Write a protein that binds this ligand. Structure first.
Ligand SMILES: O=N[O-]
Ligand SMILES: O=N[O-]
Ligand SMILES: O=N[O-]
Ligand SMILES: O=N[O-]
Ligand SMILES: O=N[O-]
Ligand SMILES: O=N[O-]
Ligand SMILES: O=N[O-]
Ligand SMILES: O=N[O-]
Ligand SMILES: O=N[O-]
Ligand SMILES: [Cu+2]
Ligand SMILES: [Cu+2]
Ligand SMILES: [Cu+2]
Ligand SMILES: [Cu+2]
Ligand SMILES: [Cu+2]
Ligand SMILES: [Cu+2]
Lengths: 333, 333, 333
């Protein structure tokens, strides 16, 4: 009887931050209640000021990271306000049946729905909108996020000993396909319906115009750079709902990586770069050993540095000259 | 002495079905005899009626799945009838030496050949045509399939206990490169030779015009949807001879996955989506837990829903409300 | 005290060859001294005579393979002669801190620098130039290589028993983006600065014009084919600093593969084809069992046979008819 289980309500937070949770489950299985409100909105995605009509869960690209434990039930209230124009739904890759919930959650503007599913498999998983006939358009307009289903006894290393993270961040990587004309300029559209065919044509090139973290070029830089201290253990959850990516921490490693994101498997050790296939979430654990600026990138470096898939960590602490040093600084002989 | 071994003749079946076989070997090592007849033919590949000159093993795209056991010998009689126009051969990724057999199997129209090789490594493997100088053209015109070399004691899980499948299907995913003009219309050609340079130019874009399962958009839908019952254990073998893919069962999982298809390795557990690199076959095992329609897709969703890489499962049985339920059906408040 | 450790100087060799080293460490931890001189030079990259302005470490594409043992220190003297025009640096994926050394190694023409880092993680790793603001241009102009950090007790199999290679080769795979005009002809440029914007535009297509091994179409063929004898154990280290690749030995296998290149992990067994993500080095171990010509390719076969990512092995020794034989040679019935 699900009615006999504890209920807990979670208020979600904006990526790259993650709602408060416990790694090791302090209660028995629970029904965990989430609410998301769909927001269609204009978003500026690059330094040039290119503005798209984005489709979002909870006002952000990506949608927020949900965190539960294995064999919890997820109960999502999904609200489509009448200020929106399109039909939406949600498909959880964590869920079993009914197209991941998509068949049960179709909401027109002015409607809401509540879905419950049992999180039977531990791992990080993508969720995304998937309305019949228009799936890639919604996903590539930003309507995707992730859910983490932790093992009830938390994460474990390749030998089965505990791994505990001190901080967690969620990086959602988004491929956008802004339509271009013969000259190569971005085309502009008045209504979603007038945009649709050109959006399909742009998608069929399989060549994104932008590939960004947290919804825009430079979103995870400057005042919004990720932070850590030397010695801290950081988990970075990374998703890509549509297209392969290959994350890399410039100056660091993935000490333990679940590249395809599923915690019953042993992690890969000491990775430089890891492949997260399109339609997947992955997770990487790293202990910082040096201070300074790190770049966190998709290591197709054109995708990173020309198309947008690059963010920064600012790390505080002591410099270790045993690990790295300048022996002779750049100079003319 | 190979002449002292049992011989068995197999008659192949059209994908996505697979010839009858035993998972656990009921005889000692055998010579397993297969015959394939090459057929060059017109094929309609999409709903628009786009027709290509396809190159096939046994009349289908993909070619049929061959199944043997580790350390069996495969003896293939390959027939190129005089109704065909081109030179063909075959390269087995399962085989050792002579370019996988390609150096030994070159047949002009009106010729045949018989190759024997020892299947020394267990796994699912690609086979494809590979005539010197024209390899990608033949492979991307459909001339590829797969072979499964089962361990003699069948499949095993990550802990070494038996995994037995109830049903098996073979999904071959094909990237086509139909030449386009400046306007973006598909060009049409009278002879293979007149097509060749434009085919090469289209291939060099690295952007497929179509990506399909079982030879056409929608081939694994409707009356030809895959089927299962709740509780059945299904193995899906998936190959891609030329280009990476990332299969996903919408509403399900890969419970046990050999993403790069080789059975001496432990399977990955609980996958949402798995990467099968171009030039590889993989295999995924799933036990259905919910009825209804599932979509089986390449989770580049543009590739799936715009370019063709999507099929369906129709699953019969009981709905489990513990696993998933609509709490409040879509409605206006 | 690092000053108390042995020092050894290594003189590097041109790929695909590798400097002499010992698999199992015969000394304690050492400081291993390398020197590289940057050379900007014209290179002919294809059979058509297309000539680019290449940027190289030590005069080659890829840069040379460096080999050390876990917890050795790498001390690199990097020289940028005044005959060069651009600013360069180096980022080691093996290193920890300061953008892999990139923040500490910026050298203008006429300058040099010496970096030291501790090789704390065993595996094969990419190194590449990464000057702020111009990273992908330098990497995709050839300025990348790899470093192998061997475990001190050498390589081990999936069960922890020793694997010893008899020969080692280094294959660097390079994606080039030669700018094209409306007609599709390669554009030509007088100075690096006049080339830059068109280089960026060409990179943003995400469609390489050339994908080559050892710096040119056909570089690892003919008189420069790789060689082995039947029974020899060969390690092939393969890197791709920017773009995914999927190596395959046509007629063979990867007996033991570290696809993402990190030796604390067990190898994948019996691979047909393996995915090395962009920004990664991998390693594959194979024991040759048949003589003849093998092709070693990226198994996107368009990338291999149209764009250049194909080389040869010439293997000497006895033919094994048990493994493969022609039963009936091609003939007309
Ligand atoms: O929603 N993609 O970050
Ligand atoms: O930031 N992408 O053009
Ligand atoms: O870094 N002092 O030459
Ligand atoms: O032959 N490709 O499915
Ligand atoms: O179905 N592909 O255009
Ligand atoms: O689903 N009943 O509101
Ligand atoms: O430098 N790439 O082989
Ligand atoms: O060899 N590439 O065009
Ligand atoms: O190969 N002799 O027919
Ligand atoms: Cu939507
Ligand atoms: Cu999905
Ligand atoms: Cu053929
Ligand atoms: Cu092949
Ligand atoms: Cu440089
Ligand atoms: Cu890098």
């Amino acid at each position: 009887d699900i009615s006999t289980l504890p209920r807990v309500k979670v208020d979600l937070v904006k990526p790259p931050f993650v709602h408060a949770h416990d790694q090791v489950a302090k209660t028995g299985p629970r029904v965990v209640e989430f609410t998301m409100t769909i927001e269609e909105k204009k978003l500026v995605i690059d330094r040039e000021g290119t503005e798209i009509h984005a489709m979002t869960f909870n006002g952000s690209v990506p949608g927020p990271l949900m965190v539960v434990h294995e064999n919890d039930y997820v109960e999502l209230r999904l609200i489509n306000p009448d200020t929106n124009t399109l039909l939406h739904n949600i498909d959880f890759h964590a869920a079993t049946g009914a197209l991941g919930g998509g068949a049960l959650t179709q909401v027109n503007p002015g409607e809401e729905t509540t879905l419950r599913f049992k999180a039977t498999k531990p791992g990080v998983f993508v969720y995304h909108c998937a309305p019949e006939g228009m799936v890639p358009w919604h996903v590539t307009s930003g309507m995707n996020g992730a859910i983490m289903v932790l093992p009830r006894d938390g994460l474990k290393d390749e030998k089965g000993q505990p791994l505990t993270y001190d901080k967690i961040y969620y990086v959602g990587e988004q491929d956008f396909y802004v339509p271009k004309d013969e000259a190569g300029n971005y085309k502009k559209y008045e209504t979603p319906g007038e945009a649709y065919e050109d959006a399909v044509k742009a998608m069929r090139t399989l060549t994104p115009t932008h590939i960004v973290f947290n919804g825009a070029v430079g979103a995870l830089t400057g005042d919004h750079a990720l932070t850590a201290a030397v010695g801290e253990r950081v988990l970075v959850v990374h998703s890509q709902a549509n297209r392969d990516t290959r994350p890399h921490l410039i100056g660091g490693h993935g000490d333990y990586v679940w590249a395809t994101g599923k915690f019953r498997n042993p992690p890969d050790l000491d990775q430089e770069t890891w492949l997260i296939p399109g339609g997947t979430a992955g997770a990487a654990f790293y202990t910082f050993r040096q201070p300074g600026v790190y770049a966190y990138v998709n290591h197709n470096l054109i995708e990173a540095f020309e198309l947008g898939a690059a963010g920064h960590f600012k790390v505080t602490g002591e410099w270790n000259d045993d690990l790295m040093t300048s022996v002779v600084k750049p100079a003319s002989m």
